[PDB]
Design a protein around this ligand. Structure first.
Ligand code: MG
Ligand code: MG
Ligand code: MG
Ligand code: MG
Ligand code: MG
Ligand code: MG
Ligand code: MG
Ligand code: MG
Ligand code: ZN
Ligand code: ZN
Lengths: 83, 24, 91, 98, 102, 70, 150, 160
RNA sequence: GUGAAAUUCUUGGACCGGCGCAAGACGGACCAGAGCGAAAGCAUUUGCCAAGAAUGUUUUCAUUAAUCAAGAACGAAAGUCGGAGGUUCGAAGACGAUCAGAUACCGUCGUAGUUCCGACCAUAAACGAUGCCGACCGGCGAUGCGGCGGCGUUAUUCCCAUGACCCGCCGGGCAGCUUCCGGGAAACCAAAGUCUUUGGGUUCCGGGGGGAGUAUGGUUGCAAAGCUGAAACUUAAAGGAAUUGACGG
């Protein structure tokens, strides 16, 4: 394809491309609200967190660090931050 | 000759030359 | 300045006894007259008294060791083997 | 992990907490009752180790047997001399839990 | 001229491959270079299967197989005709010869 | 076979062996004929098994690294 | 490519185009500064401080939220480490390798890695002495470096 | 055995003879050459474990177990290779579930349960959560030491 | 044992079969145009010790970088020195064959060596006969690692996780197929392309064939030898890739 529009790529290929190789760099990670059952406060957690995030009001772990993304403990709820 | 055997022959000749010169 | 190119401690033997014999005795004499770190007090004051006897100046500890080195690799492997056989013998 | 963790915690006791290095000062601090942790190299003489353990039992203070020697404990303290016995007056870094 | 792109062996991202001995002449050949044949032969001849079946003390006795992996230097392979020389274009294929089932 | 029959043995298990070791693993030309002759002589046949000595790994095979030049 | 390895990896961090602080971040500049102060007193290096702050407290960039970098904040308060973090970790690695090597004399791979690590140490020390972070007479000695780390 | 497999062989050394009857006892077992060679195949990983374990009555046995990774029915990939940590976990699992089937029981009920190779079957069942295996057997067992040869024990092994 | 033999071992039980013992090597099959390592190289289990690429990162520093005379580390095999060990194989050597001869190819035996520890040597067709860093320039299917997303099958369990498959995407690798991208003397090469439309940075290095990697000097080494390295003289070709023919035990 000699006439690919490099200026305006559609979001499908814009997302399939590597983070650095996009037209403008965009991280693949995000921030999430996490709810621990039996607790009221809301924890802001990085999606690719490298540390065990703990609640200050309960001796419970929220996420476990993995290779790519922090695995949330079962029973915990989460939502995105502003897409 | 094979190049390896020319190399061996030259090494023998060089040892003989060194021995002759050292004798002097 | 550097006083000898290669003889080092066997420069006291002059031209005698042969270069290979002097080279052979060089490392043995260096290890013989070296001061080793004492494993009891931690000081570098463990030196040979007689053949096989190594005394520390500070803690006055005397150890049975090698002829020219504080310990021999043979004895080290022996100690490790005896420890392994003891821990295998008991449970 | 334990050895590197205790080395790092000792490094942070240095430069941030009050300590004292050596047998005589360690005994003096223990009998003043303000030594909260006493670290002993495994190189320590057996009599000295036993006596410091008895002093610590009397003073109700903890004793940690460092897995090094006096040279390595000096290095862990960051000094260029051998230390065989040391005491911590106050950690300042959660080496000693409140 | 370079006869083969792979230099007649399978070594691609390696420095050294351990040698093996040719089953015919005991020559040291790199393992990735030697011609390997995995022969799975009936332990008895197809002429003698009936005699062994008749002389068997069992009725439904399955005759054992014989599993031998043979390694050849290319000299013995060519002399024994397991491999043959091919044209310049025909050297490039790697498909094994058909089993000729029917 | 005739010696076995006159000593009163009727059936035989079979253990086929090649040279083994670091040397060849293929049985020689005589195995097939020997077993077929035993079968056709009236001797009964039982289990058959190969017992060729297979090294988990062996000493160096004779012949040098250039092999047997012929 | 890597300085001392034949690797050409691309794993990096893609900082977003939006430099603005997110609206859901309730932490103020002084609050983040106090958190950094507490973590530095606990003994964390600036990389670990940033990791903890991003993972737990939801702050994306300390520079974006406060206007200053973590090392700048620590140096302004007066509790930045005497050695730079990366130089300290390189010296720590070199000390560990030397400690392994003095028992494993046949570990020629370890000797090669030690040469690589010490070359990196010397290049980084040259850079820091050029930038006057380090004293002009600062030198890495293999014998006395063990008392500086851990 | 009346209807068991044929690729399993037992050694059955003779300890005592009385009258015209030699009396045997277990000495070891082995798989056959053809069965082992047929099990070994390409594009798959085999895990081998060995363990020295003492029975309750003083028989010391060296057990050798083998297993081979199994390809799925819908698998398209040619090879079925287990990673090194998976192989190590499988080996550790199949060592620790050969120990406990020998340590807590006598040689008689060790032999009668390796007759159907139930040890290999439970090894294969246990290892499915790491990597599937199909050809799992106790490949070999050899007697290392024997306890003093009690004739009463020999006679109760033979008769009742 | 061989093409055939013979040297050799054998009624003293050789070979063969069985049960044991001892020693030192070697880690088959799994084992792949698969992995790791700067190369050399690396394959039985388990533990310990440090190390590492790739990946993930909205972490940190902020140009700290690339290539590099001199210098330094490692560097197959053979070889050298000291100590252990020496099963097999096996330079030298001995013998039997073969032959016109046969100091060989084949066979029997066998020293050094091959093994381990420590110290040298620094050479290989040490090869991809192909410097490193960076950018761009086709398609396709795979494979290894890591990550991400999805119908489903499977393992237990009560569901998700987590493994084993299936379908894709991304990044870094070993490669492969294909192509009038282009290049090249061509073989061929997605690099050996982006070169008379000649300039991204940088290191080494060749100047017809021989003499010759020789002489000499210097330097390194216990030695063997390694590095540096001419000239006289001689020669009209020597070479590379392809084509046709002829020939092939
Ligand atoms: Mg040719
Ligand atoms: Mg090579
Ligand atoms: Mg021929
Ligand atoms: Mg070598
Ligand atoms: Mg020697
Ligand atoms: Mg021989
Ligand atoms: Mg350049
Ligand atoms: Mg010229
Ligand atoms: Zn002392
Ligand atoms: Zn061959």
């Amino acid at each position: 394809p000699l006439a690919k529009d490099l200026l305006h790529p559609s979001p499908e290929e814009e997302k399939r491309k590597h983070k650095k190789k996009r037209l403008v760099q965009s991280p693949n990670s995000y921030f999430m609200d996490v709810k621990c059952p039996g607790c009221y406060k809301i924890t802001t957690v990085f999606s690719h967190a490298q540390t065990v995030v703990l609640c200050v009001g309960c001796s419970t772990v929220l996420c476990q660090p993995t290779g790519g993304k922090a695995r949330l403990t079962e029973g915990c709820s989460f939502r995105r931050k502003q897409h | 000759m094979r190049a390896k055997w020319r190399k061996k022959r030259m090494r023998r000749l060089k040892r003989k030359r060194r021995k002759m010169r050292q004798r002097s | 300045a550097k006083r000898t190119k290669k003889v080092g401690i066997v420069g006291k033997y002059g031209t005698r006894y042969g270069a290979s014999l002097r080279k052979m005795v060089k490392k043995i004499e260096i290890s013989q007259h070296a001061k080793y770190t004492c494993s009891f007090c931690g000081k570098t004051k463990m030196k040979r008294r007689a053949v096989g006897i190594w005394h520390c100046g500070s803690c006055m500890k005397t150890v049975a060791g090698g002829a020219w080195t504080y310990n021999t690799t043979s004895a080290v492997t022996v100690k490790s083997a005896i420890r392994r056989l003891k821990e295998l013998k008991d449970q | 992990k334990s050895l590197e963790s205790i080395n790092s915690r000792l490094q942070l006791v240095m430069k941030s907490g009050k300590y004292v290095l050596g047998y005589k000062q360690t005994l003096k601090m223990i009998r003043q009752g303000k030594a909260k942790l006493v670290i002993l190299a495994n190189n320590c003489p057996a009599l000295r180790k036993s006596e410091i353990e008895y002093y610590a039992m009397l003073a109700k203070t903890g004793v940690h047997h460092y897995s090094g020697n006096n040279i390595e404990l000096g290095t862990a303290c960051g000094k260029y001399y051998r230390v065989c016995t040391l005491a911590i007056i106050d950690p300042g870094d959660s080496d000693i839990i409140r | 001229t370079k006869k083969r792109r792979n230099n007649g062996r399978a070594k691609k991202g390696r420095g050294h491959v351990q040698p093996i001995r040719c089953t015919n002449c005991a020559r040291c050949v790199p393992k990735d270079k030697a011609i390997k044949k995995f022969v799975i032969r009936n332990i008895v001849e197809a002429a003698a299967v009936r005699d062994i079946s008749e002389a068997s003390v069992f009725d439904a006795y399955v005759l054992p197989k014989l599993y031998v992996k043979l390694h050849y230097c290319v000299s013995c392979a060519i002399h024994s005709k397991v491999v043959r020389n091919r044209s310049r274009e025909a050297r490039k294929d790697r498909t094994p010869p058909p089993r000729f089932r029917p | 076979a005739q010696r076995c029959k006159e000593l009163g043995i009727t059936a035989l298990h079979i253990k086929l062996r090649a040279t083994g070791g670091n040397r060849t693993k293929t049985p020689g030309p005589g195995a097939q004929s020997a077993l077929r002759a035993l079968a056709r002589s009236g001797m009964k046949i039982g289990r058959i098994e190969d017992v060729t000595p297979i090294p988990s790994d062996s000493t160096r095979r004779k012949g040098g690294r250039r092999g047997r030049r012929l | 490519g890597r300085m001392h390895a034949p690797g050409k990896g691309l794993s990096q961090s893609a900082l977003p185009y939006r430099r603005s602080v997110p609206t859901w971040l309730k932490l103020t500049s002084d609050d983040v500064k106090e958190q950094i102060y507490k973590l530095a007193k606990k003994g964390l290096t600036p990389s670990q401080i940033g990791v903890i702050l991003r993972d737990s407290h939801g702050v994306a960039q300390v520079r974006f939220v406060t206007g200053n970098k973590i090392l700048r904040i620590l140096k302004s308060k007066g509790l930045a480490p005497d050695l730079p973090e990366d130089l300290y970790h390189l010296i720590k690695k070199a000390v560990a390798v030397r400690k392994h090597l003095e028992r494993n004399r046949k570990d020629k791979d370890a000797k090669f890695r030690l040469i690589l690590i010490e070359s990196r140490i010397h290049r980084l020390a040259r850079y820091y002495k050029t930038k006057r972070v380090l004293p002009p007479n600062w030198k890495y000695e293999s014998s006395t470096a063990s008392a500086l780390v851990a | 055995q009346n209807d068991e497999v044929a690729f399993r062989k037992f050694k059955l050394i003779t300890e005592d003879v009385q009258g015209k009857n030699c009396l045997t006892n277990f000495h070891g077992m082995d798989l056959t050459r053809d069965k082992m060679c047929s099990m070994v195949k390409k594009w798959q990983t085999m895990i081998e474990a060995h363990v020295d374990v003492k029975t309750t009555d003083g028989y010391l046995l060296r057990l050798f177990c083998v297993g081979f990774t199994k390809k799925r029915n819908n698998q398209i990939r040619k090879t079925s290779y287990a990673q090194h940590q998976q192989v190590r976990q499988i080996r550790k699992k199949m060592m620790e579930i050969m120990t406990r089937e020998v340590q807590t029981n006598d040689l008689k009920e060790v032999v009668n349960k390796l007759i159907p190779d139930s040890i290999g079957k439970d090894i294969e069942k246990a290892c499915q959560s790491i990597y599937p295996l199909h050809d799992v057997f106790v490949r070999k067992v050899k007697m290392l030491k024997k306890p003093k040869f009690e004739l009463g024990k020999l006679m109760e092994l033979h008769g009742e």
